[PDB]
Coordinates of C-alpha atoms and ligand atoms in Angstrom, one line a residue:
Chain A
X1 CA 0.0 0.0 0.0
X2 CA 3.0 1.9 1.1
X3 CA 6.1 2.4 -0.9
X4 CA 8.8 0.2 0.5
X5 CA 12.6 1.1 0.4
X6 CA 15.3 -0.7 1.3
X7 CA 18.6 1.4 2.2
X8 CA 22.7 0.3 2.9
X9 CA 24.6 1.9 4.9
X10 CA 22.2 3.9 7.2
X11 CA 24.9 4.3 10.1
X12 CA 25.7 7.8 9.1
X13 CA 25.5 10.4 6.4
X14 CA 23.9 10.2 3.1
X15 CA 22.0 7.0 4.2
X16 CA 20.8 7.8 7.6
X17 CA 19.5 11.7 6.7
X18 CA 17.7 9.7 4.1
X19 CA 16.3 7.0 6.0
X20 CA 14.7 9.5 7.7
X21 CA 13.6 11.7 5.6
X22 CA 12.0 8.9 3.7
X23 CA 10.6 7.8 7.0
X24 CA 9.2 11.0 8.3
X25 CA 7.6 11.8 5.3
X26 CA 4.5 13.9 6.1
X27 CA 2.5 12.4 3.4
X28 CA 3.4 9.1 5.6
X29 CA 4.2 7.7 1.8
X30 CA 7.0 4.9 2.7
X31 CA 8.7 1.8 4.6
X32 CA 12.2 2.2 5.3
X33 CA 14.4 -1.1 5.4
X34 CA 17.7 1.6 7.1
X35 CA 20.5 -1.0 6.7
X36 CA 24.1 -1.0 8.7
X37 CA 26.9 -3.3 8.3
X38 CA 26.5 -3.6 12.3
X39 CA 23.2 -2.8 14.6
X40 CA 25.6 -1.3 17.4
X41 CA 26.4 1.9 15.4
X42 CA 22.3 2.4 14.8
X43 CA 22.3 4.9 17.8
X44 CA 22.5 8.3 15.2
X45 CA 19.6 6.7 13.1
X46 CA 17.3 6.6 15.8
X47 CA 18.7 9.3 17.7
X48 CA 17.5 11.3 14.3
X49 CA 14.3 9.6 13.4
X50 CA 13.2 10.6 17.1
X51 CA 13.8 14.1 16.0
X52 CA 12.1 14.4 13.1
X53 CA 9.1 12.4 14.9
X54 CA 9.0 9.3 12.1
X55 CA 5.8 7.2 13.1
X56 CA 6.4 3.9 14.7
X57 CA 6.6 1.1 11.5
X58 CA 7.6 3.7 9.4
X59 CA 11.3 2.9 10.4
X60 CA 13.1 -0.7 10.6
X61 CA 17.1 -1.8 10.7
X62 CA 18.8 -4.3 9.6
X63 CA 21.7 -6.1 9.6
X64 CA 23.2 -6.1 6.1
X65 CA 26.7 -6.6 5.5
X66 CA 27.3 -6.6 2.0
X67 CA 30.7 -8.4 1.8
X68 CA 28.6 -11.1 2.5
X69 CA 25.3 -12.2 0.3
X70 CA 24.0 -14.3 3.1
X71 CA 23.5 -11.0 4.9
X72 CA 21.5 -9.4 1.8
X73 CA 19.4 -13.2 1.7
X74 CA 18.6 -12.7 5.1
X75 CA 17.7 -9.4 4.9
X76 CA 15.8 -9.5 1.6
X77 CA 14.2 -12.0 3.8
X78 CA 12.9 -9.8 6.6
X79 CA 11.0 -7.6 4.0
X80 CA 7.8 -8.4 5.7
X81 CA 6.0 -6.6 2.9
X82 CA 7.8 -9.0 0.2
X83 CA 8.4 -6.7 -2.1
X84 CA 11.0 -3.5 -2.7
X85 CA 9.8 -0.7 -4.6
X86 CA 12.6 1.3 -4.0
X87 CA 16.4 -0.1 -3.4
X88 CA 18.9 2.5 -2.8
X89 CA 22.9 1.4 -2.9
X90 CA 24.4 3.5 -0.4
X91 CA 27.2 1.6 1.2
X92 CA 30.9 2.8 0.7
X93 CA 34.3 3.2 1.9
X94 CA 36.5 5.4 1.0
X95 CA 40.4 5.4 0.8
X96 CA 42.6 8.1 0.8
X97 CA 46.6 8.0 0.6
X98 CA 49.3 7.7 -2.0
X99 CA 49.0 4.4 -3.8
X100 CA 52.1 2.5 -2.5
X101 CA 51.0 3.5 1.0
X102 CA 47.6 1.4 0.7
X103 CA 47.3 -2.1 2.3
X104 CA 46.3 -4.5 -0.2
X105 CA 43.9 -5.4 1.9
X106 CA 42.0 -2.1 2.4
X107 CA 42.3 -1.6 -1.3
X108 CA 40.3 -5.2 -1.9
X109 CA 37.9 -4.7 0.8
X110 CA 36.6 -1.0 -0.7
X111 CA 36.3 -2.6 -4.1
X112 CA 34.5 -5.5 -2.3
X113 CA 32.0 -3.2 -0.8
X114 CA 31.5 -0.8 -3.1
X115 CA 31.6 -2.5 -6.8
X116 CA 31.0 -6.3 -5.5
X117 CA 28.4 -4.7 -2.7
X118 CA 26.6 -3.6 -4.7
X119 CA 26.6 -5.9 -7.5
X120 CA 25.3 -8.9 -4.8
X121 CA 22.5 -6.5 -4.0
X122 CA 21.1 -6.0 -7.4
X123 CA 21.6 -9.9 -8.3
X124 CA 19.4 -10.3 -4.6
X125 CA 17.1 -7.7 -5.9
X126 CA 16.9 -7.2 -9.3
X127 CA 15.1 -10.3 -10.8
X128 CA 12.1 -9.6 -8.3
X129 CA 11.8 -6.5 -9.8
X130 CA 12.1 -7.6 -13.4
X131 CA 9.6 -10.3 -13.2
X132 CA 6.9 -7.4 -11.2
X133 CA 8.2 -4.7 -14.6
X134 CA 8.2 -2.4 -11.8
X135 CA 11.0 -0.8 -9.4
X136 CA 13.4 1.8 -8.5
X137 CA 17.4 1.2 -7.8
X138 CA 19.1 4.6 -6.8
X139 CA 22.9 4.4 -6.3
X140 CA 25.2 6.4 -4.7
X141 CA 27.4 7.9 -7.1
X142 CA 30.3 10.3 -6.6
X143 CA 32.5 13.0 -8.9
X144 CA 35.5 10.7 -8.0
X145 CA 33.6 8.5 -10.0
X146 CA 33.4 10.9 -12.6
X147 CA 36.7 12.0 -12.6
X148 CA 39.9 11.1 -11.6
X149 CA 41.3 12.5 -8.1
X150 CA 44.9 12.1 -7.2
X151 CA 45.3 9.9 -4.2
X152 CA 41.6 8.7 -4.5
X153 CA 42.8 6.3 -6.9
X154 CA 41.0 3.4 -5.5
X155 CA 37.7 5.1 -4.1
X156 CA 37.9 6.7 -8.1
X157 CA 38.5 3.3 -9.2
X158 CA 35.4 2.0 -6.8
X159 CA 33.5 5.2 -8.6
X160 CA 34.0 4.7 -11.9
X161 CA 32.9 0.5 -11.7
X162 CA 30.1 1.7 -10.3
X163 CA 29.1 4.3 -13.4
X164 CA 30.3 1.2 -15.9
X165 CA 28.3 -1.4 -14.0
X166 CA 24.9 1.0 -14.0
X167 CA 25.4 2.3 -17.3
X168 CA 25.6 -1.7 -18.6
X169 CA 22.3 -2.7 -16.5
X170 CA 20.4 0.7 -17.6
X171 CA 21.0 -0.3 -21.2
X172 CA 19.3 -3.8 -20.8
X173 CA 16.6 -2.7 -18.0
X174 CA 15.3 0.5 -20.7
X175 CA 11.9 -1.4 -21.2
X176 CA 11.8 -3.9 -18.6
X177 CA 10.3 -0.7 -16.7
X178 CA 12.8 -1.3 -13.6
X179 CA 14.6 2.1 -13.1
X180 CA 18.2 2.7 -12.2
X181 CA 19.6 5.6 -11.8
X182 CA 23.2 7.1 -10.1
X183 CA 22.9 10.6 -7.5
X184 CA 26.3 12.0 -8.1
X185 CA 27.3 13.7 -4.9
X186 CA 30.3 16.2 -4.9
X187 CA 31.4 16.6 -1.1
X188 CA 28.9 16.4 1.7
X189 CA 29.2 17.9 5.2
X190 CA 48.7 9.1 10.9
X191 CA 51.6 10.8 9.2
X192 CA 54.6 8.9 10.3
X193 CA 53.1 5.8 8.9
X194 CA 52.1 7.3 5.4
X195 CA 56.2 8.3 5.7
X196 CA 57.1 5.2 6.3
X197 CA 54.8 3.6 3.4
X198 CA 56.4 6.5 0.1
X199 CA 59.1 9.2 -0.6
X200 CA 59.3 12.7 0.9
X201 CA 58.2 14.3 -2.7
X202 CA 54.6 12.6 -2.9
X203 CA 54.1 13.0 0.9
X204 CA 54.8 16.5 0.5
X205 CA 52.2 16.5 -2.4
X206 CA 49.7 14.5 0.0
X207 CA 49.8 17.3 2.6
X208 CA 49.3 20.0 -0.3
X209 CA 46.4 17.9 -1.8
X210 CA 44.8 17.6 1.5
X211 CA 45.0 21.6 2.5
X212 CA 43.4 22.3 -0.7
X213 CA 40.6 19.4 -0.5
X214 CA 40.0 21.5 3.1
X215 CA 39.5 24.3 1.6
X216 CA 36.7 23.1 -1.1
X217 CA 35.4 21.0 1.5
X218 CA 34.4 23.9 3.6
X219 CA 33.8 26.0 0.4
X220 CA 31.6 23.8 -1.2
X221 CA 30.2 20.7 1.0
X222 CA 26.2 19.9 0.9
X223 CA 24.1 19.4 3.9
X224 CA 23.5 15.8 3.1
X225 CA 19.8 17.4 3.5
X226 CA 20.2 19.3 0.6
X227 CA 22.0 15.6 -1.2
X228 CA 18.9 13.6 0.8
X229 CA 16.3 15.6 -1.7
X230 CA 17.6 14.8 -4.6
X231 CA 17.4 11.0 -4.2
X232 CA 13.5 12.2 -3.8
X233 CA 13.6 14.3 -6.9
X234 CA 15.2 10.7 -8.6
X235 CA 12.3 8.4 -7.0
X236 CA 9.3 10.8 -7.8
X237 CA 10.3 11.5 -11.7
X238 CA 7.9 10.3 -13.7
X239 CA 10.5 9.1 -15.9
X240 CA 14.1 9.2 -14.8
X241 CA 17.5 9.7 -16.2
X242 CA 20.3 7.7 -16.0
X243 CA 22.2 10.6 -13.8
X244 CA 21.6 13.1 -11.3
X245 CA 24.1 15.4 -9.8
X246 CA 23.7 17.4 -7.0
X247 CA 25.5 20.0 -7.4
X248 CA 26.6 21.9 -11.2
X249 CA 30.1 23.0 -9.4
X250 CA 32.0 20.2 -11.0
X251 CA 30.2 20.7 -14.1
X252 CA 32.9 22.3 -15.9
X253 CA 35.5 20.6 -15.1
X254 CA 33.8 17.8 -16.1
X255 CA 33.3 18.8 -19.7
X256 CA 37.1 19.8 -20.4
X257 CA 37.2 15.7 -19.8
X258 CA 34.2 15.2 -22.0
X259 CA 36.1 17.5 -24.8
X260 CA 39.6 16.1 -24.7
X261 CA 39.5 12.3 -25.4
X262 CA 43.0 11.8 -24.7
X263 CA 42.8 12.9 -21.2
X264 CA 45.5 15.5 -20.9
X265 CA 43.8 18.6 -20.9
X266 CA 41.6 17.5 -18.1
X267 CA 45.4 15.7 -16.3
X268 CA 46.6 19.4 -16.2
X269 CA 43.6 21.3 -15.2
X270 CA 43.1 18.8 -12.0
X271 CA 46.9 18.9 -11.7
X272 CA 47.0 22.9 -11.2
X273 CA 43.8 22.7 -9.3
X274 CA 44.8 20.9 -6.3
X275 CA 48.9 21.9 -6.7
X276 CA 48.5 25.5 -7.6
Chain B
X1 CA 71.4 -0.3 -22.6
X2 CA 69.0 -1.9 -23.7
X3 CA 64.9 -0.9 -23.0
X4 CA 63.2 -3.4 -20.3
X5 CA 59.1 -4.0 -20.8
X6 CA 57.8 -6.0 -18.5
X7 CA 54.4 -7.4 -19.9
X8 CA 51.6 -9.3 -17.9
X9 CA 48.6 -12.0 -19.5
X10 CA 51.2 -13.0 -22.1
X11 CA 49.7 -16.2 -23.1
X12 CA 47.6 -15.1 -26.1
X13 CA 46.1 -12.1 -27.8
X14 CA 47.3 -8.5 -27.2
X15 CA 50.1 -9.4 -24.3
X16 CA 51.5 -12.1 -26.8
X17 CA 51.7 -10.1 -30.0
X18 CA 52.8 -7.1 -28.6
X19 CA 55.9 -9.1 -26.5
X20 CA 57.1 -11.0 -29.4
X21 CA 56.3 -7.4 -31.5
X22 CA 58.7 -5.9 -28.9
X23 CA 61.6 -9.0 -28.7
X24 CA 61.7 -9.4 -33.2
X25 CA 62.5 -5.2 -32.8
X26 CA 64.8 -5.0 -35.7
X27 CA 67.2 -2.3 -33.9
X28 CA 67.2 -5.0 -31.2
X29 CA 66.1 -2.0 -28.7
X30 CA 63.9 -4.1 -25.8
X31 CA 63.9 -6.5 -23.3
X32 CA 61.0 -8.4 -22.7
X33 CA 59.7 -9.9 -19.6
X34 CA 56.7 -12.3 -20.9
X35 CA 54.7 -12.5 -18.2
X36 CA 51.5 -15.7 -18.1
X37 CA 49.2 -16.9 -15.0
X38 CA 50.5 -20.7 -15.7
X39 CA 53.7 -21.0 -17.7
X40 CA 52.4 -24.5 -19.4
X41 CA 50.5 -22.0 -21.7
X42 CA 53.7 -20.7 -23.1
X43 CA 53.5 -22.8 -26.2
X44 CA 52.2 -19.5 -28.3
X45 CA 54.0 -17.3 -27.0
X46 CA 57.4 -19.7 -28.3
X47 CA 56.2 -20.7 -31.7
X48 CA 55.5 -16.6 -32.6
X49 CA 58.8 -16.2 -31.2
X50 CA 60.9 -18.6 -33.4
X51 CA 58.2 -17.2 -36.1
X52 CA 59.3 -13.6 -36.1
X53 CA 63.1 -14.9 -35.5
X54 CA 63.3 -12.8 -31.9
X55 CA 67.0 -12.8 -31.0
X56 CA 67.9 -15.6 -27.7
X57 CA 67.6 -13.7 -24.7
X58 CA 65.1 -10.5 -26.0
X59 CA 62.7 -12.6 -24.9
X60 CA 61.9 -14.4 -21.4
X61 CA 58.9 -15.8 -19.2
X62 CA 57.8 -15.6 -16.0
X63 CA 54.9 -16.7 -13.7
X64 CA 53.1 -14.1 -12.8
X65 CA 49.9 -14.4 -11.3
X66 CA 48.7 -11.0 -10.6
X67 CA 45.9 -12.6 -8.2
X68 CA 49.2 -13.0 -5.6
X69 CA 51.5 -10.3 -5.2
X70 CA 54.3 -12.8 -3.9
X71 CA 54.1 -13.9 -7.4
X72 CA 54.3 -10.0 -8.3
X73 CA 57.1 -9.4 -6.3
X74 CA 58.8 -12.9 -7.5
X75 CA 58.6 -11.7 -10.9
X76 CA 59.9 -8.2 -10.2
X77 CA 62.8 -9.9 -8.1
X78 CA 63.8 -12.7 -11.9
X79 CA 64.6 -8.7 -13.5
X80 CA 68.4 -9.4 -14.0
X81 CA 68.6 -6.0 -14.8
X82 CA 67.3 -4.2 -11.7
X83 CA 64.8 -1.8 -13.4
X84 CA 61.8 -1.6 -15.5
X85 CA 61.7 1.1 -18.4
X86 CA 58.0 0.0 -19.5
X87 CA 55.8 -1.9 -17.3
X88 CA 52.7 -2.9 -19.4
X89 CA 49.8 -4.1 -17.3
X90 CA 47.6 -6.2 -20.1
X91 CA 46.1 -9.1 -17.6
X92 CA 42.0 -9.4 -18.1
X93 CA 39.4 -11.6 -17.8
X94 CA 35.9 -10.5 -19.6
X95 CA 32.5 -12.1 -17.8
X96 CA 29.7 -12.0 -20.4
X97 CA 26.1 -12.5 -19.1
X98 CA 22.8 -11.8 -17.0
X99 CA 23.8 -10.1 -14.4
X100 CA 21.8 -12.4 -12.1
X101 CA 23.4 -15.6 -13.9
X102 CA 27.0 -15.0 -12.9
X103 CA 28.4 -16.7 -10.0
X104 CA 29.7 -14.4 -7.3
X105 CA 33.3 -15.7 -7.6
X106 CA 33.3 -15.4 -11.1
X107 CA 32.4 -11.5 -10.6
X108 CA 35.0 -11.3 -7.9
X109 CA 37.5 -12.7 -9.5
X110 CA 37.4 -9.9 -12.8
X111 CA 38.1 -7.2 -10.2
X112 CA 40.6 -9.1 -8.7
X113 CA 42.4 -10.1 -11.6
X114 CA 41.6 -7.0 -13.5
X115 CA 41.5 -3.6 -10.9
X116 CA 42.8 -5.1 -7.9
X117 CA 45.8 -6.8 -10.5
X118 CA 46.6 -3.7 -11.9
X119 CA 46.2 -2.2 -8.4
X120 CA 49.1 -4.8 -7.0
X121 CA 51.6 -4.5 -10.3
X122 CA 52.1 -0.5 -9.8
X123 CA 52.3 -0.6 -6.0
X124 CA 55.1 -2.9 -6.7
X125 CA 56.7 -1.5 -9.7
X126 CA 55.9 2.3 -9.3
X127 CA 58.5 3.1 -6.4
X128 CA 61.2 1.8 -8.1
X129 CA 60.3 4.4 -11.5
X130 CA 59.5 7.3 -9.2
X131 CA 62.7 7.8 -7.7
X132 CA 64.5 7.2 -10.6
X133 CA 62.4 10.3 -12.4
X134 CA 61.7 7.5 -15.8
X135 CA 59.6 5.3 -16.4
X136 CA 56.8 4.3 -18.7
X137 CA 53.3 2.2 -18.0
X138 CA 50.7 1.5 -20.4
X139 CA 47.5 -0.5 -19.5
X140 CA 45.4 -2.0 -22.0
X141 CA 41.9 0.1 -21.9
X142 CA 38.8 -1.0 -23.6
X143 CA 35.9 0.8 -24.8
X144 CA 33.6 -1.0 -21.9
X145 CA 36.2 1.2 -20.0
X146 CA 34.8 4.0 -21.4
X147 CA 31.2 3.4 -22.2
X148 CA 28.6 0.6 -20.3
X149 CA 27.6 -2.7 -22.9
X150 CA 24.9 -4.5 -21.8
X151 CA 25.0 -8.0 -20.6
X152 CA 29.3 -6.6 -20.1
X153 CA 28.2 -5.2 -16.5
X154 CA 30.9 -6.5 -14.2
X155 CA 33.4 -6.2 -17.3
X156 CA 32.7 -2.6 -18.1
X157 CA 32.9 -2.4 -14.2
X158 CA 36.5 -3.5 -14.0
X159 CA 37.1 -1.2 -17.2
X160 CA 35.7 2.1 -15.9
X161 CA 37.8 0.8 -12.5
X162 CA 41.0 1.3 -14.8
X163 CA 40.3 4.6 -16.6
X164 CA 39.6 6.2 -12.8
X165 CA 42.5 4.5 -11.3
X166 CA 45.4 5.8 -14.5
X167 CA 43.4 9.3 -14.3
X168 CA 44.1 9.5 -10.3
X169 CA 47.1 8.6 -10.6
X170 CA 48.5 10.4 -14.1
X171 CA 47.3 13.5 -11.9
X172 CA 49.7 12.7 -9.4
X173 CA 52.7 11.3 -11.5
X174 CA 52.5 14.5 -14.0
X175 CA 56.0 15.8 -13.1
X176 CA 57.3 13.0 -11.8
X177 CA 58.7 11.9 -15.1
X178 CA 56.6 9.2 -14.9
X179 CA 54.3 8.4 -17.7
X180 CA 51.4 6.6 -17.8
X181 CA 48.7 5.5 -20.5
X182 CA 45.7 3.8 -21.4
X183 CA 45.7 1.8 -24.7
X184 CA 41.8 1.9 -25.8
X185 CA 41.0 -1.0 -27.7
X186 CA 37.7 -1.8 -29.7
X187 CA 37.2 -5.3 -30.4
X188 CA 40.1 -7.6 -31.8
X189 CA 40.4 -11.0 -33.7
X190 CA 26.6 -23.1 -22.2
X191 CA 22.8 -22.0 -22.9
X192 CA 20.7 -24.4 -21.0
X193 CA 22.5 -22.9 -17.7
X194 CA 22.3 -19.2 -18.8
X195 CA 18.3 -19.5 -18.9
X196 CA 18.3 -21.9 -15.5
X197 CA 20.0 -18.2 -13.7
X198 CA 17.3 -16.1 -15.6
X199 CA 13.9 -15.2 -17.3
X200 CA 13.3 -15.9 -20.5
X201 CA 13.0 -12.2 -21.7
X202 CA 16.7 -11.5 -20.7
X203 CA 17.4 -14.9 -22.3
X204 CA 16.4 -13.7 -25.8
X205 CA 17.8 -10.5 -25.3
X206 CA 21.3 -11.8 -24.5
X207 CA 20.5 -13.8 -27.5
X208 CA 20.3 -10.5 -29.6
X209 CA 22.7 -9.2 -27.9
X210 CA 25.5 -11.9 -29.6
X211 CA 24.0 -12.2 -32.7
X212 CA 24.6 -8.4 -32.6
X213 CA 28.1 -8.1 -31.4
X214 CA 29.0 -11.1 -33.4
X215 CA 28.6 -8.8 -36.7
X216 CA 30.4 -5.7 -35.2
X217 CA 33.3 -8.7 -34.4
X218 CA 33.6 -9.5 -38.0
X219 CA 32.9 -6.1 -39.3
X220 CA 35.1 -4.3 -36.8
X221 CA 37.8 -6.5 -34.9
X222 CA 41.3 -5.0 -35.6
X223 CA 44.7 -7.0 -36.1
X224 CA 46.6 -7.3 -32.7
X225 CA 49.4 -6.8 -35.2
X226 CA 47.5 -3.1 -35.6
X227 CA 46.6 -2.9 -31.9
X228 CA 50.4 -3.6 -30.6
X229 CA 51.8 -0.9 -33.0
X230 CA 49.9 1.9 -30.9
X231 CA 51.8 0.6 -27.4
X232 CA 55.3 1.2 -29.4
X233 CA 53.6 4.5 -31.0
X234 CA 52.9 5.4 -26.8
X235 CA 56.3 3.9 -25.2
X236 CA 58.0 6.1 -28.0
X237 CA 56.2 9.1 -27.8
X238 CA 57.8 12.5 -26.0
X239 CA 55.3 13.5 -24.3
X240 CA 52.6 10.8 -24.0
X241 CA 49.0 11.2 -23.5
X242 CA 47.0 9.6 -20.8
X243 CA 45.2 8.4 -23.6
X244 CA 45.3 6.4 -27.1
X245 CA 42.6 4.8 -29.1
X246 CA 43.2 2.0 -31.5
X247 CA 40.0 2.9 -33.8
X248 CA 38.1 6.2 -34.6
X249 CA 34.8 3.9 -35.0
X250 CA 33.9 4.5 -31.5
X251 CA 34.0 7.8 -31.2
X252 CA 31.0 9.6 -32.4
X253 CA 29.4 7.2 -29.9
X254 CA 31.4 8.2 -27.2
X255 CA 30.6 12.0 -27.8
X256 CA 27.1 11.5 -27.6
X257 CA 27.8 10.1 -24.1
X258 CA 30.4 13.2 -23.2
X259 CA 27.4 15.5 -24.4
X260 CA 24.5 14.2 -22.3
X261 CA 25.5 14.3 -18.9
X262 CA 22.3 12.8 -17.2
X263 CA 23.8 9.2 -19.4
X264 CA 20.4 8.6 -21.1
X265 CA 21.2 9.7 -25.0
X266 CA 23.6 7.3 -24.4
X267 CA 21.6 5.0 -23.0
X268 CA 18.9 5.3 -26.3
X269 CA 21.8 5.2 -28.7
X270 CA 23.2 2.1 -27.0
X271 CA 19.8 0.0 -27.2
X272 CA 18.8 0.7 -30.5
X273 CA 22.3 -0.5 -31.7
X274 CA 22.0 -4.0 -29.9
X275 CA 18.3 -4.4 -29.6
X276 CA 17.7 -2.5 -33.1
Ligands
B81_1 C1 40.1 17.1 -5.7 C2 39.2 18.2 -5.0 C3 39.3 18.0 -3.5 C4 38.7 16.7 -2.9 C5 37.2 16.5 -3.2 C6 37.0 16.8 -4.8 C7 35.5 16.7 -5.1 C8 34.9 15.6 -4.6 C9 35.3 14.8 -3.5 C10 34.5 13.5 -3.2 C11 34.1 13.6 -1.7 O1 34.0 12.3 -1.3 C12 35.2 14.2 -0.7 C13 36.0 15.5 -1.3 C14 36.5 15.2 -2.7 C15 37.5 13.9 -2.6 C16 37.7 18.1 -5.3 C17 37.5 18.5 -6.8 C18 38.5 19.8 -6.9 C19 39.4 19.6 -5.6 O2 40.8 19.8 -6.0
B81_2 C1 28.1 -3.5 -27.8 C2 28.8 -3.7 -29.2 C3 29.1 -5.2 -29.4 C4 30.1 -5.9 -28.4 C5 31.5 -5.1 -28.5 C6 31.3 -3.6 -28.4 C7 32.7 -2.8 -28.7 C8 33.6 -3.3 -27.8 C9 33.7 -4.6 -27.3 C10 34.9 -4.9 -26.4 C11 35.6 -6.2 -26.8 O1 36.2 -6.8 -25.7 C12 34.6 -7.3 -27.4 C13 33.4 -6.8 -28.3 C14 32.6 -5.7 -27.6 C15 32.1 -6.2 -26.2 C16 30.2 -3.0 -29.4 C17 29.8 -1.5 -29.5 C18 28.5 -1.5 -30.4 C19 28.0 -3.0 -30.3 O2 26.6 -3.0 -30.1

């Protein structure tokens, strides 16, 4: 009766303010599945949907771990309602640092949760929706998945799979009438060992990447509010693109990519960007 | 004195062609590290040798598995000569399919082999060319790198992975000396199981989908002989770009994309070419 939405990664930040806001909807519209990797960290999602009064049932966690697709079985299993209108793929690390100075570990684990996350997800999800011709996958996309940042490398490289992997599934789903469609966020409100890990040139290039990311950070993050809405503006379009962004900042940047094939144009405006 | 490549996935296909390209070199210029997951699948890499008459000893194999970097560094540590001029990261696996139909391990395994590879070789090999102020490292791109195919999901995924990863980093490496490149290739010369992890719909769509790319195979594939000669036009170039394409064809396709942000001009193009 109720539109039903299933959410990862509702600990904190983009997922949680829209759990919420789905949840407190005035029109009392939906049925929020917030999911965490782990039920101890819930305390800011319900902390928050206290605040912004969300009815009791309107609201439900879950334990969804999505290294793991016996987790997203057993969660897609405690969708009382049986259905999912509305799946939104918000789980994701990120991973900062010069390249050398990653563990191989970390660097496998972001790629397991982000790309192969979020593939297991849609493989749990999808063919219900296919069958049904009706349903609505929104992903959280990024401008690091646009473009490449330096010493994002693997968070871009997370970002980009994800726009290759949607743009693939999009392409078959057109008239299947199951929706997908990528929010593309631009930001959103130890040393020694990094030493240790590289040379004194690229550390040195670290600290000047990081003052300047402050700087755009406080110049230019979104109240995840304002990012929150747009996921809305996504789920309500009577017919929906392939893309939104959330902010038109990046834009331009953007298109001196889009207009130099061969990548170098775009290599040396990011290059004086962030390194003067 | 002389130039050492070091080339992964040498078994067959690009990797092959392009080392024993490199080891016949009639200036006898280059010194070529043949890298192949299992050495027993050497035997094609040998008879193209003797065929192009490489010299004894511009050519030489290794195991490298890039699934393991103890093989990585075990292949690093056979380089007699202490340093790598031109590091060519050409490994791949492809995964064709349903999304829903492909096994879990199978999708893990692309980004392992394929980002998470990649990822392994340059932490490995990257140090060594920084310091040094030379080196060169090209990276065999794909147009599913730069543009989602349908039923290619997971390999377009691992593709996109690689454009984001080289841009991050050629962002950082700019004046390092370093150089790095993608090589953008177009394409290049059981059923019953398939509809068990599907509908039937997707089923004959896949089914359009290969009698489709079967005709752009045969009406598009280039020579590897063709594809290998833009590496050596990149490993020779002054100034390299981030970016090289083997073919034009897929251009005016690609612009389309580049012009409509929001994905879905792309995404109308793209299924009236495959679903006519
Ligand atoms: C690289 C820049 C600083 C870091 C910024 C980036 C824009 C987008 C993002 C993604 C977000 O996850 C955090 C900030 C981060 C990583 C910026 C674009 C221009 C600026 O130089
Ligand atoms: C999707 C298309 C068929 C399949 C083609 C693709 C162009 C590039 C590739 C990558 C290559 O690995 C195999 C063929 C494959 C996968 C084509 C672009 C137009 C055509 O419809």
């Amino acid at each position: 009766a109720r539109t039903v939405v299933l959410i990862t990664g509702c600990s904190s930040g983009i997922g949680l303010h829209l759990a919420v806001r789905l949840a407190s909807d005035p029109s009392q519209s939906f049925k929020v599945y917030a999911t965490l990797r782990d039920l101890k960290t819930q305390g800011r999602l319900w902390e928050a949907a206290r605040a912004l009064a969300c009815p009791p049932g309107s609201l439900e966690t879950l334990q969804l771990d999505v290294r793991d697709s016996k987790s997203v079985a057993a969660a897609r299993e405690r969708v009382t309602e049986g259905r999912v209108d509305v799946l939104v793929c918000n789980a994701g690390l990120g991973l900062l640092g010069p390249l050398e100075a990653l563990g191989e570990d970390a660097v496998a684990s972001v790629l397991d949760v982000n790309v192969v996350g979020t593939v297991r997800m849609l493989q749990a999800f999808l063919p219900d929706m296919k069958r049904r011709g009706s349903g609505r996958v929104l992903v959280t996309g990024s401008v690091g998945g646009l473009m490449g940042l330096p010493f994002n490398d693997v968070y871009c490289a997370s970002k980009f799979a994800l726009e290759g992997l949607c743009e693939s599934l999009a392409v078959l789903l057109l008239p299947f009438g199951v929706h997908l469609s990528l929010i593309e966020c631009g930001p959103v409100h130890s040393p020694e060992e990094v030493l240790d890990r590289t040379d004194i040139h690229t550390f040195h290039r670290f600290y000047q990447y990081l003052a300047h990311s402050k700087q755009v950070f406080r110049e230019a993050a979104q109240n995840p509010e304002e990012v929150a809405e747009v996921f809305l503006t996504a789920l309500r379009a009577p017919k929906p693109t392939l893309r939104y962004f959330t902010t038109e900042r990046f834009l331009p940047l953007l298109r001196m990519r889009l207009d130099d094939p061969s990548g170098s144009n775009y290599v040396t405006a990011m290059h004086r960007e962030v390194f003067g």
